[PDB]
Amino acid sequence: NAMSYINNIEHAKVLDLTQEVMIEQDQMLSRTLVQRQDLGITVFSLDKGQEIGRHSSPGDAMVTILSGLAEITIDQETYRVAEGQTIVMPAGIPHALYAVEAFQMLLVVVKPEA
């Protein structure tokens, strides 16, 4: 079984994603599960005050907040996404993320095939 499709994470093991990407002082960390033409999957942590600058993706980007609180901007509007909450940031529309508190997220970006 030499092919792996979900990378940088142990297989056949019970895990806690919030332990796979620790929050680090004044830093942002990522564990990139998938990085291909039509799909990104990444676990992130951002310390309080960190930010992902405004940009647009060609795919729909689903954000699931695993801990803390994140301020999400989609075009004009801001959304405060807390632990256990999810938002889909639509393809082609600028978005940004600000760490209101330190937070961890699963980011699944689904791009045009393939």
Reference 73, options 91, 94, 59; nearest CA is: 94
Joined tokens for residue 67: 């801990």
The SS3 of residue 18 is helix
Task: Give the Cβ contact number of residue 49 at 10 Å.
Answer: 11
Say what the resolution is, in angstroms.
Answer: 2.0
Structural domains counted in the chain: 1
Q: Would you list the DSSP string of 20-80?
A: HS---TT-EEEEEEEEETTEEEEEEEE-TT-EEEEE--SSEEEEEEEESEEEEEETTEEEE
CATH number at residue 113: 2.60.120.10
Left if phi > 0, otherwise alpha if psi is -120 to 50, otherwise beta: which for 91? beta
CA atoms within 13 A on the CB side of 63: 28
Residue pair 55/6 in contact by the 8 Å Cβ criterion? no
Reference 28, options 62, 53, 8, 51; nearest CA is: 51
- Residues pairing with 75 in the sheet: none
CA distance 27 to 50: 7
Domain that holds residue 89: 5-114
